[PDB]
DNA sequence: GGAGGCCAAGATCTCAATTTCGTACAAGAAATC
DNA sequence: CCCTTCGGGAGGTGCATCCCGGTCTCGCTTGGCCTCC
RNA sequence: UUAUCGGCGAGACCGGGAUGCACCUCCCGAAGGGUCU
């Protein structure tokens, strides 16, 4: 029952990005910020924790084994319990407050829930935010523009029948006319968005409703396009991401980690190393990271912690130093007493 | 400080140099030729002694190790006390007594310790003088590589400019690039033993920088030689050790107080010198109960912003116009203390040649000439950061300026590499604080340096108990008396405690609308 | 159903350039910077992804085969779906519940769409950024100046009739007059913007609409010119590109790739190797690449990856190493059960 | 969509004032031991799923001179992820006093 | 409809120079460097492309032939479109609907413009 | 048969919505390791 | 010892998405009922 | 400081799609020469 603090750095192999609804606004896509507009962006601990929770869920699914076709014995409710801590049945044993050793049995028989918690059950694993090292190290990646395939290379046009060529003609004319009309409507809307600043709350209200009905006018204009609802040619808004090679200091804790639970966590890190992807924009290979963690335990009452070992995740492999981490992984792997199935 | 006294041989040079021009008083020359006495005392006492006192040639040359430095040092080893420049106390730092000798016998009074620390932050440097490294390896010289050294020598001057240390992003980038472009030269030294010595030298330089602390670009104080600066953390602990080494050292200064309370205003120096609780024997603030009179006018929170776009250092025209008109509204001799020499240039240009003729501190211009010239003819003296404390004293020890005008608070520019490199220090030394935390710490340290510098500026005002100074702080960011929650509230500590009542009752040029709000 | 990581280097046989809207500014064509303004530039993974996606689309078009006239069976909507993943008919719903399990069959029958996803279907292929290895590996190329043909060479004057030499004289005089006009108005506009620097925030907008007035007057002095709309003689501003021989580290992932999807990807790599052109500036032959990839796989739960083989694309040929890459390519070639005419 | 929670930024320097009133060596020793055990898991507040609350704090332990109104610095308690650095011989004396004096009767 | 790659070498019978406006620091005429001050200078593809485009223009006018006086049938706008690529009368627009699928026929009729765009 | 513990029931209600931005330099002395 | 050249002309346009889905609680006593001492 | 004391907490991957590209010759003019076993 040790408190393992994984202190380490997440070097970035391909840009690390995340779209969090709070941070992003109409100004564009912005990384979650360390308390302010002019703040260092941080990769949320939420995304890392969810990625690691799904990695651990896959570890448990593979450990419990797969049937002949490949289906796990777990039902849908159990998978949601393990991966997101949500009980869809509602049969999950709610621990009425004041219950001594709340979930000690569930923790013992469900290492994954013990680590990542549940509703009313504290998750031993705390996955902190990954803050960058050094100024800069973030930038507007992605970007560019979707382009009409046939207006970039004419060789793709030899593959189209005459009717399809006229279909493309109609699509482009429709896109042009819709763009002109929507741009006029958006210029009026932008005049209103300037007019906001004289925000007399009543005029603010009427102006906002005017922007709403202008938006509905835009939507109706785009709904009367027979061929293409959406403009094919359009600039892709850039997304803010941590640059490649960015060093992000990361701290994780497993409070009161049994050897089994910490072994499960290390196995989850091992399986995450297979696809070490954090965040989104994975179509641009965003999220690949190599991370090295120093595992330090701290026997309460002792002035200094002792380093159990080190977990290094790189594209060439997972290097685990320290016999302690190996012993924990083996203890997790050699215990048959995990009834991951719901009670 | 030495190098500014009789050099023996240069005083036989003086025989020749005077006979061409000072022939009339050549007899007094030989009187000097024999008494190898410190020139500094010499002139002031012997009636005026202007004949043959031109300093330029009387001083040591660049390689003037004539063993007389020991002789005056041995002569001065005896004393009741030693008035002198700071140099020895950090020049014998690691000489191991080869200059001063006995230490425990000696006591240390670091007068003006504020500037001591402030320039210690420069002395935390080792000048990797590429000319010296060029000169050092004059036999194992891959002369083809000299161009690289020459190109880098150009770049340092471009980034360092006129600064012995400069915190632009270029400086650390040039530091890394220069040492990488010197690692290129590293595979050019022919002699393998010299190659390894060069490799080890740059490797020591490489680790000294990256392992911890700050990198930068230097222009040497003397001879204006470009150099590649980086931290000497070892010297950083050494200064503490070497000041504790004295039997009982005393750091005293007129502006060594951020706030009027010791036990929170003294932690900048405690932490800077790494000084822990061992050697904090007293922390006392002593101010005169009555000393001169101070009237305060401070620019209110409506006075236009100083910098419209501070990144390129453009002074907003509204601010320049307001400052210039306010200065023109003065009616007596004044000492307008700006922060930069560019602000002096702008004020002088826009200032429409008002009466009480103006006087400007040209970049690099020694303050002695201009101050003496202004003493005879009084008037607006637009000094700058080059004020270097001292005093614009009237000739017969009387206040010849009534109005000390601080155009703008001398805010230090952001150090985006000091914060980054210090973050590297804390990261590699294991301390876990994020880069923005180091940015905040550096900001607070710089703001405390600004508080000390502005305290020095206000200290220029009153020097005699009869002095009366009307201080005009034209910066909008100086906290208003009513704004106790203002961001730069610590700047209120600039005013001495005794004159805080007139700070509270101060005329505001451009105050900010108040009202009679019924919900009082 | 294994993850394939193509880790490797792109060597630039000719300068490699791209024009991202956000990356570019009033200065001119500039590569994205991989962070702040002065950060080391990177080639967008979006350009690489689009090039390989269109290569794969052409691969699928050839594999399905062309009718006698040379037309492809795919509808225009199907072409856009395969190559750009835009549903022109607008029948692609983002979170329709009923397509939750139709994704597996859609991927199985449409390997390209599984590889390169669409709006609502995650793309198994993540094509990362290409980041240079060394420093100072980029530069401004393409700097030029369009020059009057008949002033560079006089032998072209003997081919023009009297009325056409008079046309060239009117054109030259209109260009010189237009030039003097636009040059004096831009030499007042530039000092007006050199006054906008020291500007009261309010005055920013007034000097801005002064700039837009001067721009309208430049555009009306251009709409006044009869002979030519744009001056023939003009300096072409250079664009920023990676130098020839630049080595750019590249990282591409196919998450949980079936044999046939990875085979389609390798076929796309081969067909891109037929024309190894990335980015743009097809004039000046920019974009030509010689790329070599080490395909590594990582069975989740294993501590090390296994190098399946290497994909070397050189101007002299496409070399495939490893029996597994050949097996995947052959599996893709021999799987006749793919349907792309239906999303 | 998970609602955000308002926290103090990573690497936020928060000024903290704690005090023990008139203190037998045993009570102060117990407090210092509590700080030493809190440094094992230096967590303040909730949202521990995101590792929230992890702090490192340097406390300058001042006391009042007998009679005089002046603070004398007895030591420093630097809790960091790398360890707890108790500074000052007097703080160690308080901790040792608490460790000894085993007559405490916490029951009732 | 094949992609032809001419890979090869240019041997320089007499010195090869080009005054790229960006490249020439007012210090002196410098060949356009392949990135930075110290890279290997290259001859721009722009100059070669212009030379070959004017050569193709001359090929086209000679193949069309000249009148008895020796005047090309083309007009000034046609020459400028062929070699310079610039439209005098402004009849050139990008991504304009309706010229779509006019590229195939235009290229077939005008191989020069197809080549050099 | 008495003493612990778990769980369901009990009257309606009292209230309010920010809208990012720090800081923009000078030189004291020098037998430097 | 000479002496470092003038200039010319700096673009035209496109297009800026669709959509989810926003929680439990609980701050008190009390007896009815269900199991243990 | 009109009293003494009370961690608010526990769970959640926001992700999914797009080549920004399409045209330009920067050229035109020149002797660096004379001077000494």
Short mmCIF file of C-alpha atoms in Angstrom, two decimals, chain C residues 2-343:
data_model
loop_
_atom_site.label_atom_id
_atom_site.label_comp_id
_atom_site.label_asym_id
_atom_site.label_seq_id
_atom_site.Cartn_x
_atom_site.Cartn_y
_atom_site.Cartn_z
CA UNK C 2 -2.13 -4.18 -35.93
CA UNK C 3 -0.59 -0.73 -35.63
CA UNK C 4 2.00 0.18 -38.28
CA UNK C 5 4.42 3.07 -37.68
CA UNK C 6 6.28 4.34 -40.74
CA UNK C 7 9.20 6.16 -39.11
CA UNK C 8 11.63 7.49 -41.66
CA UNK C 9 13.20 10.34 -43.58
CA UNK C 10 12.17 12.40 -46.59
CA UNK C 11 15.13 13.65 -48.64
CA UNK C 12 14.18 16.56 -50.89
CA UNK C 13 15.42 16.06 -54.44
CA UNK C 14 14.02 19.49 -55.31
CA UNK C 15 12.92 22.29 -52.96
CA UNK C 16 9.79 21.45 -50.98
CA UNK C 17 7.30 24.27 -50.45
CA UNK C 18 3.76 24.87 -49.21
CA UNK C 19 1.50 27.91 -48.77
CA UNK C 20 -0.62 27.68 -45.61
CA UNK C 21 -2.97 30.65 -45.23
CA UNK C 22 -2.24 31.23 -41.54
CA UNK C 23 1.49 30.63 -42.04
CA UNK C 24 1.72 33.21 -44.83
CA UNK C 25 1.48 36.93 -44.11
CA UNK C 26 1.94 40.24 -45.93
CA UNK C 27 5.63 39.35 -46.35
CA UNK C 28 5.00 36.51 -48.79
CA UNK C 29 4.89 32.75 -49.09
CA UNK C 30 6.34 31.28 -45.91
CA UNK C 31 6.35 27.74 -44.57
CA UNK C 32 4.66 27.01 -41.24
CA UNK C 33 7.12 27.52 -38.42
CA UNK C 34 6.44 24.63 -35.99
CA UNK C 35 5.59 26.96 -33.12
CA UNK C 36 6.38 30.65 -32.87
CA UNK C 37 7.45 33.00 -35.63
CA UNK C 38 11.14 32.03 -35.47
CA UNK C 39 10.64 28.31 -34.84
CA UNK C 40 12.16 25.84 -37.28
CA UNK C 41 9.74 25.35 -40.20
CA UNK C 42 7.99 22.05 -40.85
CA UNK C 43 6.21 20.69 -43.89
CA UNK C 44 2.49 20.29 -43.06
CA UNK C 45 1.35 16.76 -42.43
CA UNK C 46 -1.85 17.94 -44.11
CA UNK C 47 -0.12 18.34 -47.47
CA UNK C 48 1.50 14.91 -47.17
CA UNK C 49 -1.83 13.40 -46.12
CA UNK C 50 -3.65 14.98 -49.05
CA UNK C 51 -1.01 13.91 -51.57
CA UNK C 52 -1.06 10.32 -50.34
CA UNK C 53 -4.87 10.34 -50.13
CA UNK C 54 -5.16 11.40 -53.76
CA UNK C 55 -2.53 8.82 -54.67
CA UNK C 56 -4.61 6.16 -52.91
CA UNK C 57 -7.74 7.42 -54.65
CA UNK C 58 -6.02 7.00 -58.01
CA UNK C 59 -4.86 3.55 -56.89
CA UNK C 60 -8.44 2.53 -56.13
CA UNK C 61 -9.64 4.04 -59.41
CA UNK C 62 -7.10 2.00 -61.37
CA UNK C 63 -7.83 -1.15 -59.35
CA UNK C 64 -11.56 -0.90 -60.03
CA UNK C 65 -10.62 -0.11 -63.61
CA UNK C 66 -11.84 2.24 -66.32
CA UNK C 67 -14.43 1.61 -69.01
CA UNK C 68 -13.48 1.73 -72.69
CA UNK C 69 -13.84 5.52 -72.93
CA UNK C 70 -11.61 5.76 -69.83
CA UNK C 71 -14.24 6.80 -67.27
CA UNK C 72 -14.40 5.50 -63.71
CA UNK C 73 -17.59 3.91 -62.29
CA UNK C 74 -17.44 6.09 -59.17
CA UNK C 75 -19.90 8.96 -58.88
CA UNK C 76 -18.55 12.47 -58.38
CA UNK C 77 -19.80 12.18 -54.80
CA UNK C 78 -17.84 8.94 -54.48
CA UNK C 79 -14.69 10.59 -55.84
CA UNK C 80 -15.01 13.37 -53.27
CA UNK C 81 -15.70 10.84 -50.51
CA UNK C 82 -12.66 8.72 -51.35
CA UNK C 83 -10.15 11.51 -51.95
CA UNK C 84 -11.42 14.39 -49.78
CA UNK C 85 -14.11 12.80 -47.58
CA UNK C 86 -16.83 15.39 -48.21
CA UNK C 87 -20.35 14.01 -48.67
CA UNK C 88 -21.68 16.33 -51.36
CA UNK C 89 -25.15 14.77 -51.19
CA UNK C 90 -25.09 15.58 -47.46
CA UNK C 91 -26.25 12.12 -46.36
CA UNK C 92 -23.34 11.66 -43.91
CA UNK C 93 -24.66 12.10 -40.37
CA UNK C 94 -22.12 12.70 -37.64
CA UNK C 95 -23.60 10.73 -34.71
CA UNK C 96 -26.44 8.74 -36.21
CA UNK C 97 -26.78 5.83 -33.74
CA UNK C 98 -27.54 3.22 -36.39
CA UNK C 99 -24.17 3.57 -38.13
CA UNK C 100 -22.44 2.68 -34.83
CA UNK C 101 -21.76 -0.90 -35.96
CA UNK C 102 -21.95 -0.23 -39.71
CA UNK C 103 -18.50 1.32 -39.32
CA UNK C 104 -16.78 -2.07 -39.23
CA UNK C 105 -18.45 -3.30 -42.42
CA UNK C 106 -17.91 0.07 -44.11
CA UNK C 107 -14.21 -0.15 -43.28
CA UNK C 108 -13.98 -3.76 -44.44
CA UNK C 109 -15.63 -3.02 -47.80
CA UNK C 110 -14.00 0.43 -48.28
CA UNK C 111 -10.33 0.15 -47.28
CA UNK C 112 -9.54 3.67 -48.50
CA UNK C 113 -12.22 5.27 -46.34
CA UNK C 114 -11.07 3.25 -43.35
CA UNK C 115 -7.52 4.41 -44.05
CA UNK C 116 -8.51 8.04 -44.74
CA UNK C 117 -11.65 8.66 -42.73
CA UNK C 118 -14.55 11.00 -43.41
CA UNK C 119 -16.77 13.35 -41.41
CA UNK C 120 -17.98 11.00 -38.68
CA UNK C 121 -15.63 8.06 -39.34
CA UNK C 122 -12.19 8.20 -37.75
CA UNK C 123 -9.31 7.80 -40.17
CA UNK C 124 -7.04 4.89 -39.32
CA UNK C 125 -4.13 6.67 -41.03
CA UNK C 126 -2.42 9.58 -39.29
CA UNK C 127 0.11 11.30 -41.54
CA UNK C 128 2.42 13.36 -39.36
CA UNK C 129 4.47 16.44 -40.04
CA UNK C 130 7.83 16.29 -41.78
CA UNK C 131 10.31 18.19 -39.59
CA UNK C 132 13.87 18.88 -40.83
CA UNK C 133 16.74 17.20 -39.02
CA UNK C 134 19.37 19.90 -39.38
CA UNK C 135 19.13 23.67 -39.09
CA UNK C 136 19.26 26.33 -41.84
CA UNK C 137 17.75 23.69 -44.14
CA UNK C 138 15.18 26.10 -45.61
CA UNK C 139 15.41 29.22 -47.71
CA UNK C 140 13.69 31.59 -50.09
CA UNK C 141 13.52 30.25 -53.65
CA UNK C 142 11.56 31.26 -56.72
CA UNK C 143 12.57 34.91 -56.49
CA UNK C 144 12.15 36.25 -59.99
CA UNK C 145 10.96 39.02 -62.27
CA UNK C 146 8.55 38.73 -65.16
CA UNK C 147 10.11 40.75 -67.98
CA UNK C 148 8.76 42.00 -71.29
CA UNK C 149 9.54 39.37 -73.91
CA UNK C 150 10.27 41.95 -76.61
CA UNK C 151 12.81 43.81 -74.45
CA UNK C 152 14.73 40.69 -73.43
CA UNK C 153 14.82 39.48 -77.05
CA UNK C 154 14.39 41.80 -80.02
CA UNK C 155 13.93 39.02 -82.59
CA UNK C 156 10.32 38.71 -81.39
CA UNK C 157 9.57 42.22 -82.67
CA UNK C 158 9.81 41.18 -86.34
CA UNK C 159 6.83 38.84 -85.73
CA UNK C 160 4.42 41.65 -84.75
CA UNK C 161 2.38 43.68 -87.21
CA UNK C 162 2.35 47.48 -87.11
CA UNK C 163 -0.87 47.60 -85.10
CA UNK C 164 0.57 45.11 -82.61
CA UNK C 165 3.79 47.04 -82.10
CA UNK C 166 1.59 50.09 -81.55
CA UNK C 167 -0.39 47.97 -79.08
CA UNK C 168 2.85 47.15 -77.28
CA UNK C 169 3.72 50.86 -77.22
CA UNK C 170 0.38 51.78 -75.69
CA UNK C 171 0.77 48.94 -73.20
CA UNK C 172 4.27 50.05 -72.22
CA UNK C 173 3.15 53.66 -71.77
CA UNK C 174 0.15 52.57 -69.70
CA UNK C 175 2.44 50.42 -67.58
CA UNK C 176 4.90 53.26 -67.00
CA UNK C 177 2.10 55.68 -66.13
CA UNK C 178 0.22 53.22 -63.91
CA UNK C 179 3.57 52.45 -62.27
CA UNK C 180 4.34 56.10 -61.51
CA UNK C 181 0.83 56.49 -60.09
CA UNK C 182 0.67 53.35 -57.95
CA UNK C 183 4.24 54.01 -56.83
CA UNK C 184 3.57 57.54 -55.61
CA UNK C 185 0.37 56.42 -53.90
CA UNK C 186 2.10 53.42 -52.29
CA UNK C 187 5.02 55.65 -51.28
CA UNK C 188 2.49 57.80 -49.46
CA UNK C 189 0.72 54.68 -48.13
CA UNK C 190 3.91 53.24 -46.66
CA UNK C 191 4.79 56.42 -44.79
CA UNK C 192 1.16 56.62 -43.66
CA UNK C 193 1.58 53.12 -42.22
CA UNK C 194 4.94 54.20 -40.77
CA UNK C 195 2.85 56.78 -38.92
CA UNK C 196 0.22 54.21 -37.92
CA UNK C 197 3.03 52.67 -35.84
CA UNK C 198 2.94 55.50 -33.30
CA UNK C 199 -0.87 55.63 -33.35
CA UNK C 200 -3.54 56.36 -30.79
CA UNK C 201 -5.66 53.18 -30.61
CA UNK C 202 -8.67 55.10 -31.93
CA UNK C 203 -6.52 56.60 -34.72
CA UNK C 204 -5.57 53.03 -35.69
CA UNK C 205 -8.98 52.64 -37.33
CA UNK C 206 -8.89 56.02 -39.07
CA UNK C 207 -5.43 55.41 -40.54
CA UNK C 208 -6.73 51.93 -41.44
CA UNK C 209 -9.60 53.26 -43.51
CA UNK C 210 -7.14 55.74 -45.00
CA UNK C 211 -5.08 52.71 -46.03
CA UNK C 212 -8.20 51.12 -47.51
CA UNK C 213 -8.98 54.35 -49.37
CA UNK C 214 -5.50 54.30 -50.88
CA UNK C 215 -5.99 50.62 -51.74
CA UNK C 216 -9.30 51.41 -53.48
CA UNK C 217 -7.51 54.15 -55.41
CA UNK C 218 -4.78 51.71 -56.44
CA UNK C 219 -7.46 49.29 -57.59
CA UNK C 220 -9.23 52.02 -59.56
CA UNK C 221 -5.99 53.14 -61.18
CA UNK C 222 -5.63 49.46 -62.12
CA UNK C 223 -9.22 49.22 -63.37
CA UNK C 224 -8.46 52.38 -65.38
CA UNK C 225 -5.63 50.81 -67.42
CA UNK C 226 -7.04 49.72 -70.77
CA UNK C 227 -4.26 47.69 -72.41
CA UNK C 228 -3.43 45.50 -69.39
CA UNK C 229 -5.01 44.72 -66.04
CA UNK C 230 -1.70 43.75 -64.39
CA UNK C 231 1.70 45.17 -65.28
CA UNK C 232 3.70 42.68 -67.33
CA UNK C 233 7.04 43.68 -65.80
CA UNK C 234 7.18 42.83 -62.10
CA UNK C 235 9.38 41.16 -59.45
CA UNK C 236 7.96 37.83 -58.28
CA UNK C 237 8.35 37.57 -54.51
CA UNK C 238 10.19 34.38 -53.50
CA UNK C 239 8.55 31.59 -51.51
CA UNK C 240 10.02 29.72 -48.56
CA UNK C 241 10.93 26.08 -49.16
CA UNK C 242 13.10 23.34 -47.72
CA UNK C 243 16.51 23.17 -49.37
CA UNK C 244 17.47 20.45 -51.83
CA UNK C 245 18.70 17.38 -49.98
CA UNK C 246 17.00 18.41 -46.74
CA UNK C 247 16.37 15.42 -44.48
CA UNK C 248 12.96 15.64 -42.81
CA UNK C 249 11.96 13.15 -40.14
CA UNK C 250 8.48 11.82 -40.84
CA UNK C 251 6.15 9.65 -38.77
CA UNK C 252 2.97 8.02 -40.09
CA UNK C 253 0.70 5.64 -38.20
CA UNK C 254 -1.97 3.17 -39.30
CA UNK C 255 -3.81 2.33 -36.08
CA UNK C 256 -5.13 -1.24 -35.92
CA UNK C 257 -4.49 -1.79 -39.60
CA UNK C 258 -5.81 -4.89 -41.30
CA UNK C 259 -3.59 -6.51 -43.92
CA UNK C 260 -5.59 -5.05 -46.80
CA UNK C 261 -5.70 -1.49 -45.46
CA UNK C 262 -1.93 -1.46 -44.98
CA UNK C 263 -1.62 -2.98 -48.45
CA UNK C 264 -3.69 -0.14 -49.88
CA UNK C 265 -1.49 2.33 -48.02
CA UNK C 266 1.67 0.76 -49.45
CA UNK C 267 0.11 0.83 -52.92
CA UNK C 268 -0.61 4.52 -52.36
CA UNK C 269 3.03 4.99 -51.39
CA UNK C 270 4.09 3.26 -54.61
CA UNK C 271 1.79 5.35 -56.79
CA UNK C 272 3.01 8.51 -55.08
CA UNK C 273 6.50 7.21 -55.82
CA UNK C 274 5.61 7.26 -59.50
CA UNK C 275 5.31 11.07 -59.11
CA UNK C 276 7.00 11.89 -55.78
CA UNK C 277 5.62 15.45 -55.75
CA UNK C 278 4.66 17.05 -52.42
CA UNK C 279 3.32 20.48 -51.59
CA UNK C 280 3.13 22.79 -54.57
CA UNK C 281 5.15 24.84 -57.05
CA UNK C 282 4.88 22.21 -59.75
CA UNK C 283 6.60 24.81 -61.88
CA UNK C 284 10.24 24.84 -60.73
CA UNK C 285 9.76 21.07 -60.10
CA UNK C 286 9.38 21.71 -56.38
CA UNK C 287 8.07 18.87 -54.23
CA UNK C 288 10.13 15.97 -55.57
CA UNK C 289 11.04 13.61 -52.72
CA UNK C 290 13.10 10.48 -52.06
CA UNK C 291 11.60 9.04 -48.86
CA UNK C 292 12.50 5.90 -46.93
CA UNK C 293 10.27 4.53 -44.16
CA UNK C 294 10.95 1.84 -41.56
CA UNK C 295 7.63 0.09 -40.91
CA UNK C 296 7.55 -1.02 -37.26
CA UNK C 297 4.66 -2.83 -35.58
CA UNK C 298 3.85 -3.06 -31.89
CA UNK C 299 1.55 -5.74 -30.55
CA UNK C 300 -0.13 -4.11 -27.51
CA UNK C 301 1.38 -5.50 -24.33
CA UNK C 302 4.79 -6.08 -25.91
CA UNK C 303 7.72 -4.06 -24.59
CA UNK C 304 9.46 -3.69 -27.99
CA UNK C 305 8.38 -3.07 -31.57
CA UNK C 306 9.17 -5.44 -34.43
CA UNK C 307 10.52 -3.93 -37.65
CA UNK C 308 8.40 -5.53 -40.36
CA UNK C 309 10.49 -3.94 -43.10
CA UNK C 310 11.46 -0.80 -44.97
CA UNK C 311 9.73 1.19 -47.72
CA UNK C 312 12.40 2.98 -49.78
CA UNK C 313 11.13 5.43 -52.41
CA UNK C 314 13.94 6.61 -54.69
CA UNK C 315 13.89 8.14 -58.18
CA UNK C 316 15.36 4.82 -59.36
CA UNK C 317 12.56 2.71 -57.89
CA UNK C 318 10.43 1.56 -54.98
CA UNK C 319 12.15 -1.06 -52.83
CA UNK C 320 9.99 -3.03 -50.40
CA UNK C 321 11.72 -5.07 -47.69
CA UNK C 322 10.29 -7.61 -45.28
CA UNK C 323 7.96 -10.47 -46.12
CA UNK C 324 5.15 -8.80 -44.17
CA UNK C 325 4.95 -5.70 -46.37
CA UNK C 326 4.81 -7.91 -49.46
CA UNK C 327 2.12 -10.00 -47.79
CA UNK C 328 0.02 -6.92 -47.02
CA UNK C 329 0.40 -5.56 -50.55
CA UNK C 330 -0.57 -8.92 -52.05
CA UNK C 331 -3.53 -9.25 -49.68
CA UNK C 332 -4.80 -5.84 -50.78
CA UNK C 333 -4.27 -6.71 -54.44
CA UNK C 334 -6.06 -10.06 -54.14
CA UNK C 335 -9.06 -8.94 -52.03
CA UNK C 336 -11.86 -8.53 -54.59
CA UNK C 337 -14.55 -7.88 -51.95
CA UNK C 338 -14.21 -4.08 -51.74
CA UNK C 339 -17.05 -1.70 -52.60
CA UNK C 340 -16.40 2.04 -52.94
CA UNK C 341 -19.47 3.17 -54.90
CA UNK C 342 -21.44 2.98 -51.61
CA UNK C 343 -20.23 4.81 -48.50
#
